[PDB]
Design a protein around this ligand. Sequence first.
Ligand SMILES: [Ca+2]
Ligand SMILES: [Ca+2]
Length: 279
Amino acid sequence: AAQTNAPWGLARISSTSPGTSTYYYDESAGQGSCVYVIDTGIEASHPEFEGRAQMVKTYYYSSRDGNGHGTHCAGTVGSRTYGVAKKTQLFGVKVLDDNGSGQYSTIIAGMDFVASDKNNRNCPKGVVASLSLGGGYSSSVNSAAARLQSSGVMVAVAAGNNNADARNYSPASEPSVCTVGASDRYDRRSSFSNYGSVLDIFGPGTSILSTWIGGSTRSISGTSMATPHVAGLAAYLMTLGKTTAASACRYIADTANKGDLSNIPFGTVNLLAYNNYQA
Ligand SMILES: [Ca+2]
Ligand SMILES: [Ca+2]
């Protein structure tokens, strides 16, 4: 299946090379897999989610995404136009308030909620979690991402937008999860992207067009937008029976476009998330 004049990020993850604008992907499109977006929530009622999105848990007055971040990250995961996995189920978990911040205790509850809640959802194809959030190192948060991962959920976390080594950010520094750096359309590492041995993969991160609240659309940059891409890709690859939750990260890193990116620090992996789809 080809989606012409697709956002550059989608087009790129179906491409050996930059500069193309068609997104190629198996028409299965992550159907029957579930991506839990742990973020500010999801405007489920956005025409772009086609009913496939729902808020499953909040730690605040409203499960409504007043911020947008989560709706935008959910969009890049499984929105019809902007999503990688156009047929995946998206499960909003609002750990972040409408100011886009959240206590580490809350976030941890959210990761643990998903580990359990997946046993309450139909995901024959397998479960993904897209942690487009981060902050200072915290072994507690790291352990929570590890647990989620262990629980049989592919976890994709942002490296962080600090242009520093991601060893010093959580859950970015957790070994067991898929730490995602960000690239731009010209295959450069996004200026803001965190790096370091801990990173597993890059994903489109700069000027990522995706769904926004008030049923709208807008481009925003950040490793936070790379992550949904890779989460999405994991949902697409699990539905194709090409990988499992446990090994998805490895499988994405094996099948990635190698050496393509410029401005990658020595000892950071030069791997760009590829769907490795042949039409
Ligand atoms: Ca674009
Ligand atoms: Ca976002």
